[PDB]
């Protein structure tokens, strides 16, 4: 399924998507992307919209 990440960081803003079998797997994909960008914040997940948010 397609999951989304809302980047709501100090310098990085925007949204990324990933393809994943489940929410836990998507979270791993998004953590890798976030780490790549140096984004380091508070994570939440909403299953109704399959959307993660990371806020710095
Ligand atoms: Mg499970």
Overview of the molecule:
By secondary structure, the chain is α+β, with helices and mostly antiparallel strands. The chain has a single domain (1-56), classed as Ubiquitin-like (UB roll). Helices cover 27% and strands 43% of the residues. Strand 3 and strand 4 (51-55) form a beta hairpin. The protein is globular. It binds magnesium ion (MG). Magnesium ion binds at residues 22, 24. The PDB classes it as de novo protein. The entry lists the keywords Beta1 Domain of Streptococcal protein G, Immunoglobulin binding protein, DE novo protein. The assembly is monomeric.
The CATH class assignment is Alpha Beta
CATH topology: Ubiquitin-like (UB roll)
Strand content: 35-45%
CATH architecture: Roll
* C-alpha termini separation: 26 Å
Rg computed from alpha carbons, rounded to a whole number of angstroms: 10 Å
The chain-level structural class is alpha+beta
Quick one: overall form?
Answer: globular
Q: What's the structural domain tally?
A: 1
Bound molecules: magnesium ion
Number of helices: 1
Q: How many beta strands in the DSSP annotation?
A: 4
What order do the strands of the largest sheet run in, or round the barrel if closed? 2-1-4-3
Largest sheet: 4 strands, mixed
Protein name: Immunoglobulin G-binding protein G
Subcellular location: Secreted, Cell wall
Organism: Streptococcus sp. group G
Sequence repeats: 2-56
């Amino acid at each position: 399924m397609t999951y989304k990440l809302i980047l709501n960081g100090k310098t990085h803003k925007g949204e990324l998507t990933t393809e994943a079998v489940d929410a836990a797997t998507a979270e791993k994909h998004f953590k890798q992307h976030a780490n790549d960008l140096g984004v380091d914040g508070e994570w939440t997940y909403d299953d109704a919209t399959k959307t993660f948010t990371v806020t710095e």
